[PDB]
Amino acid sequence: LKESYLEESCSTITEGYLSVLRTGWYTNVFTLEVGDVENLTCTDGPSLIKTELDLTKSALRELKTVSADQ
Amino acid sequence: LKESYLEESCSTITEGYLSVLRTGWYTNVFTLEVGDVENLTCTDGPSLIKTELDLTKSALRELKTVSADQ
Amino acid sequence: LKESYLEESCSTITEGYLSVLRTGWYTNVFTLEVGDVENLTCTDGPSLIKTELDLTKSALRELKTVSADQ
Amino acid sequence: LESEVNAIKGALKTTNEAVSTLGNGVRVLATAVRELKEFVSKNLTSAINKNKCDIADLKMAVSFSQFNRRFLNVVRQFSDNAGITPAISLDLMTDAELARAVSYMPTSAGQIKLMLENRAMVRRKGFGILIGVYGSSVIYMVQLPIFGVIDTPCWIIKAAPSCSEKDGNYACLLREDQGWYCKNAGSTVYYPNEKDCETRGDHVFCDTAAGINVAEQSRECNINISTTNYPCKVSTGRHPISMVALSPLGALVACYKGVSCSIGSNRVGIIKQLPKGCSYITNQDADTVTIDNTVYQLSKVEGEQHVIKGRPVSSSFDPIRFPEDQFNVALDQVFESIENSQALVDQSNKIL
Amino acid sequence: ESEVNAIKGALKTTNEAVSTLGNGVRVLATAVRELKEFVSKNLTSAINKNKCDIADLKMAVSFSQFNRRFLNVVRQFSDNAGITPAISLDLMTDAELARAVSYMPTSAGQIKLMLENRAMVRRKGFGILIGVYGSSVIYMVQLPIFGVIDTPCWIIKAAPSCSEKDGNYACLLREDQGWYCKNAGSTVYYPNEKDCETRGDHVFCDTAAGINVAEQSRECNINISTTNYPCKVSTGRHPISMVALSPLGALVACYKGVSCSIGSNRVGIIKQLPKGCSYITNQDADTVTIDNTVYQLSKVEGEQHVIKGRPVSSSFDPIRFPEDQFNVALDQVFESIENSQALVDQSNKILN
Amino acid sequence: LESEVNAIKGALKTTNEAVSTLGNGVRVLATAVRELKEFVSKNLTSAINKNKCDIADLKMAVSFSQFNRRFLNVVRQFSDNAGITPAISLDLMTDAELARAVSYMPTSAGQIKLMLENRAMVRRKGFGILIGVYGSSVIYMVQLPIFGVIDTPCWIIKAAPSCSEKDGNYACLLREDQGWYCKNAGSTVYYPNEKDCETRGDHVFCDTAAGINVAEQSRECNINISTTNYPCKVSTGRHPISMVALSPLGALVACYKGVSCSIGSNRVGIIKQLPKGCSYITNQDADTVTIDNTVYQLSKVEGEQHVIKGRPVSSSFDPIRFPEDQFNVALDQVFESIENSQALVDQSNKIL
Ligand SMILES: *[C@@H]1O[C@H](CO)[C@@H](O)[C@H](O)[C@H]1NC(C)=O
Ligand SMILES: *[C@@H]1O[C@H](CO)[C@@H](O)[C@H](O)[C@H]1NC(C)=O
Ligand SMILES: *[C@@H]1O[C@H](CO)[C@@H](O)[C@H](O)[C@H]1NC(C)=O
Ligand SMILES: *[C@@H]1O[C@H](CO)[C@@H](O)[C@H](O)[C@H]1NC(C)=O
Ligand SMILES: *[C@@H]1O[C@H](CO)[C@@H](O)[C@H](O)[C@H]1NC(C)=O
Numbered sequence A, B, C: 001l002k003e004s005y006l007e008e009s010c011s012t013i014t015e016g017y018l019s020v021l022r023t024g025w026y027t028n029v030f031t032l033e034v035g036d037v038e039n040l041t042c043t044d045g046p047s048l049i050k051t052e053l054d055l056t057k058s059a060l061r062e063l064k065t066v067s068a069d070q
Numbered sequence D, F: 001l002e003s004e005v006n007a008i009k010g011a012l013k014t015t016n017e018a019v020s021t022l023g024n025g026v027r028v029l030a031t032a033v034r035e036l037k038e039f040v041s042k043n044l045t046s047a048i049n050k051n052k053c054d055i056a057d058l059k060m061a062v063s064f065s066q067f068n069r070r071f072l073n074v075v076r077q078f079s080d081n082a083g084i085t086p087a088i089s090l091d092l093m094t095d096a097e098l099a100r101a102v103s104y105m106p107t108s109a110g111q112i113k114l115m116l117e118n119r120a121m122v123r124r125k126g127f128g129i130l131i132g133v134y135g136s137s138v139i140y141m142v143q144l145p146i147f148g149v150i151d152t153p154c155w156i157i158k159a160a161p162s163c164s165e166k167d168g169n170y171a172c173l174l175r176e177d178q179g180w181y182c183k184n185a186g187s188t189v190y191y192p193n194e195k196d197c198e199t200r201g202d203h204v205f206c207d208t209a210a211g212i213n214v215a216e217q218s219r220e221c222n223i224n225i226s227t228t229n230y231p232c233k234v235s236t237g238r239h240p241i242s243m244v245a246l247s248p249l250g251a252l253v254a255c256y257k258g259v260s261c262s263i264g265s266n267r268v269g270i271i272k273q274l275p276k277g278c279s280y281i282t283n284q285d286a287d288t289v290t291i292d293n294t295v296y297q298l299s300k301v302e303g304e305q306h307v308i309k310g311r312p313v314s315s316s317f318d319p320i321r322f323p324e325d326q327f328n329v330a331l332d333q334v335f336e337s338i339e340n341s342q343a344l345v346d347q348s349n350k351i352l
Numbered sequence E: 001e002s003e004v005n006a007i008k009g010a011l012k013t014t015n016e017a018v019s020t021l022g023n024g025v026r027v028l029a030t031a032v033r034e035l036k037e038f039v040s041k042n043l044t045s046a047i048n049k050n051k052c053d054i055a056d057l058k059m060a061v062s063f064s065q066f067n068r069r070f071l072n073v074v075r076q077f078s079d080n081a082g083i084t085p086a087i088s089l090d091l092m093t094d095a096e097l098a099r100a101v102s103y104m105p106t107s108a109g110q111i112k113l114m115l116e117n118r119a120m121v122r123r124k125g126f127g128i129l130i131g132v133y134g135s136s137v138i139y140m141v142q143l144p145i146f147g148v149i150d151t152p153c154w155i156i157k158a159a160p161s162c163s164e165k166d167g168n169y170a171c172l173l174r175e176d177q178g179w180y181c182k183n184a185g186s187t188v189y190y191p192n193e194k195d196c197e198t199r200g201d202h203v204f205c206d207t208a209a210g211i212n213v214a215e216q217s218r219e220c221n222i223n224i225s226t227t228n229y230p231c232k233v234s235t236g237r238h239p240i241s242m243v244a245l246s247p248l249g250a251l252v253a254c255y256k257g258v259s260c261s262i263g264s265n266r267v268g269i270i271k272q273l274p275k276g277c278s279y280i281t282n283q284d285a286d287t288v289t290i291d292n293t294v295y296q297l298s299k300v301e302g303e304q305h306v307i308k309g310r311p312v313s314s315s316f317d318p319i320r321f322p323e324d325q326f327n328v329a330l331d332q333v334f335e336s337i338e339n340s341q342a343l344v345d346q347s348n349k350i351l352n
């Protein structure tokens, strides 16, 4: 870089930069799906994976509320 | 929507938008508690859940430094 | 604090604040390493710890693309 | 027949060594059954109970992370942002909680409706403050926006330099009105920079601090700019400025002196050169406005389209029976041979 | 010898009893064999498989625990693609934060003062992912050095001051509005209220927004018609009715066709404001209204929630073996072996 | 002499009492072995299959978190910010995907290359928007910046107050030009604040909305400010203002009246007192500018340098062996002694 003191105006210029200017927007669309999960029918009562699934199910119900399309 | 070009000012006016302006603040206060967890004494060496608790206890001890009260 | 109404300019001065002005920057550099993990060769095929390393190895491999050095 | 009873003597002498041989055999069977029970009872149930303990440890850790997801996530968010939250996250306050607060708000039914319909914006324009920790409790406050003025007419003003030439010399006038204007009761609010207001459908969510109150007559600048009822902020210049100004629905191009302004497409290139002067083009007229080699997109350029699916999760539950019939027959078989042999030993002693 | 015929028959019956009981002992051995190799092969293999899966999961959970800070740093730098908006607890712990501040180039007293607002130090600072080499993440945190603290600071708000003589309007409006903080040899002026954040009595100002102004500008807060400083004040010919909020109150400018009133949130309007400039306190009302737009003077306090997680329990229920009843029967067997063998040595050595 | 026979008789009867005794022994061992077979078969196998079940549950849970990391992470981020993301995180769009989209962008080969080189900037200057949750699918959109204009000369002008004095009277000139200038086709773009553009190496990335297109001749303000060709933006004041303005490669200091301005170093406090007036100093000339007792840093101050490594994760797998060879030796022994028992009573029945 090159920085020059301009004594006439008590000011400074610093040159040697190169511009990177945004001229548009490019958009990609993603669709993420949860994998299939087998039913774990061996536990007594609450299974850890069944409750992890209904936990991710609730997280998605709440996430829906902030979706871009109405 | 309707955007009309004003040739006299080399400018454009775009109308049909609807205003949404903030007029105040409404605030809620939350108190979140950690659920009780039973102590596992079959330990042998360190327990995994005691380590998850001693971890969340240190995380909260650290988080108290950024609490609003001061 | 103290807020005074200036009827001559239809203005308000509110005094009693105390200043905190940034005058420079102080920087620390941190280097975090992953702990060593034993090879678990007793599972058939896909061990869970091997897959957690290959997950964090790819997360780091991707996290590199945004390192400042580049 | 003396020698016959001698034969009986030798026969019995061999017989009781055969019973004794079988006895040290049954004895060794007992030594095997003793070590097998002591291995199963002691060495094996111990290893099982140990795994039962590890099982319960690991079950407790994951269950802990499950029964306390919200608590742990709220701590995560306040640590990552050091006490404040850029947004009113889903964990800081659930949809039900957000909706009950918005319904309790001190404004009219239609504004309650609108916030409720735009709950995303309420969350983002608001934020969270960590008030305090104490022991095992996290105390924090959530700050929601009160959107009290809604649905009133609003518009945005874009402009480019209007340059004139006389004998190769230049006089250029440029509006300084550019930005957001929203109508309030008794006044008009002006937001000078374009980033200050966010568009979600036809509605404009404007950052309050940015608003500047201007007289209503400023609408008059959009009819006659040199109207004497309002002092329109317009700058004059002596030099040509060729530029592109993007509108919601289009773009203004100002071509002066030496630049080749053209309208282009995304796949095929330049399609038509624009007049020198001020041109206005619509998003449906071209897709790009170019000044020399700087190409401006009039709309967002829509790209590729992905679909990703996780790997299937499967069960590895593989239980264990015991082929009990084949065993159970052999033990009942032995107990009956036990009682027949003993009964045979009662007949043997009986003839005597 | 009527006896020796019978005695022959009898020993043969005995040798049949031993042969039958023997075929029972052999079958009992085959059953214990199938039990012994079910336990050796099928049962211990399944427990070691469970021992292996268990050890896998313990390793996984430990990896997640012993490397938490690392894994969070990867999360944060991935979520913001290399730059943390704030200095999280994971990027630099409180102990580390205080030690770094404890080495800043300032006086002990400024260090004390900085040490007091380390939350703000975290938010005004930030983190940079420098590089990933192998298994290491290298990053730098950038901390503010607050060399000026506790100097007089104030904020200026204003509304349009309109006077009317014979149908026309003359409106002066201060354009000084914003934050003023005092400094060595000058006062720093932050033009937008958003440029400085208040945490208690302290005001945290972004250095970039600051413009140094002459100290004499404070003469505008005594007499606007001061000749010593050029007070930035704009003039207009049209009335503008609006509401300006102060920390402790609000300025209202009510002119022409507007209905300005001060109200409460529970009951309604409590007092109509006259045309002109009114100054109201946070303790005079809760609301200022302009036509139908109602402004809140203070934050409106809402609900107060308290949530506790579901309890986590242990599922450890070990197993043992009822050893007494069994172990006494097998001890009995070893004696029934030893008693019978000693009895056949008796019988066999009775033959003399 | 046939009392002998009676002695053999008593002996055989004592023998058949011994066979019965060992028989009732075998019987007690068989019932003992039956309870051992049904302890292992029932209480032991069911406890193992319970643990096999919980193991598989936990395995499924952890596998679920593994196979769906991308999904779960994307959901997390959109929950922490309610639908929008400050940058295009690694989880929203992988590096491979980023490069594939950027290589498809509608621009020239070199600009595609530059974006490809700064994918960090592409991610931060872009963002992600949650479109909708449909069933178990989350659908979202990433918006990437298109850097179409690259490599044009760029510079930043900083300035301080220039005060002149004639017998206690002050005339102060201040450039109002300050900011970033980037050379473009048909104009040069001016960004009024330094925060409006971000510095990465020699490249300056710039928020498009902040840019103001100015005539090219404004460049002349940096050769002769008192140029007649352009209306150079300069403000006048009547009062002296002593201050520090930081440059990229140095700093400007303005000292007037009663202030003690000096440049200093680290270790050693002060190395040179500045003249009254306007001085320009280099980052390599000093490390500090001081205005009275306030110390300003010219560069970033290097603090500690930490290195931390996590605790090692170790295996807990300690499997179980069954001593099968020696046990099998006991069973080979038993089956041989049994077959020997049948063969000795076969010889006995052939002796009579
Ligand atoms: C899993 O199995 C249980 C067994 O009753 C059943 O009720 C449930 O609907 C199953 N879940 C799914 C998603 O198939
Ligand atoms: C185990 O938990 C109990 C409470 O349930 C606690 O009081 C005790 O101290 C813990 N054991 C330790 C810390 O060794
Ligand atoms: C673990 O062991 C397997 C085979 O025994 C080998 O192929 C693999 O590379 C090993 N991994 C490490 C990290 O040692
Ligand atoms: C388990 O078996 C080992 C040899 O396999 C032996 O040394 C140990 O004493 C047994 N019992 C226990 C409780 O470890
Ligand atoms: C604009 O203002 C001028 C002022 O003299 C007036 O002469 C002209 O007629 C006006 N134009 C229109 C279209 O009203």
Ligand SMILES: *[C@@H]1O[C@H](CO)[C@@H](O)[C@H](O)[C@H]1NC(C)=O
Pocket (backbone or CB within 6 Å): D320, D321, D322, D323, E041, E042
């Ligand atoms: C026991 O294991 C063997 C191989 O180790 C296998 O062939 C057999 O089917 C298994 N039996 C049961 C009941 O699991």
Ligand SMILES: *[C@@H]1O[C@H](CO)[C@@H](O)[C@H](O)[C@H]1NC(C)=O
Pocket (backbone or CB within 6 Å): E223, E225, E226, E227
């Ligand atoms: C301050 O106010 C007075 C009127 O009360 C008047 O002299 C003038 O407007 C002000 N002073 C100066 C020196 O202008």
Ligand SMILES: *[C@@H]1O[C@H](CO)[C@@H](O)[C@H](O)[C@H]1NC(C)=O
Pocket (backbone or CB within 6 Å): E322, F042, F043
């Ligand atoms: C063992 O299992 C049986 C069921 O087969 C049950 O009745 C008994 O109570 C269990 N516990 C013991 C024997 O200690």
Ligand SMILES: *[C@@H]1O[C@H](CO)[C@@H](O)[C@H](O)[C@H]1NC(C)=O
Pocket (backbone or CB within 6 Å): F224, F226, F227, F228
């Ligand atoms: C600077 O510009 C003015 C006007 O063009 C001129 O009077 C003055 O002489 C110039 N200075 C030099 C050194 O050319």
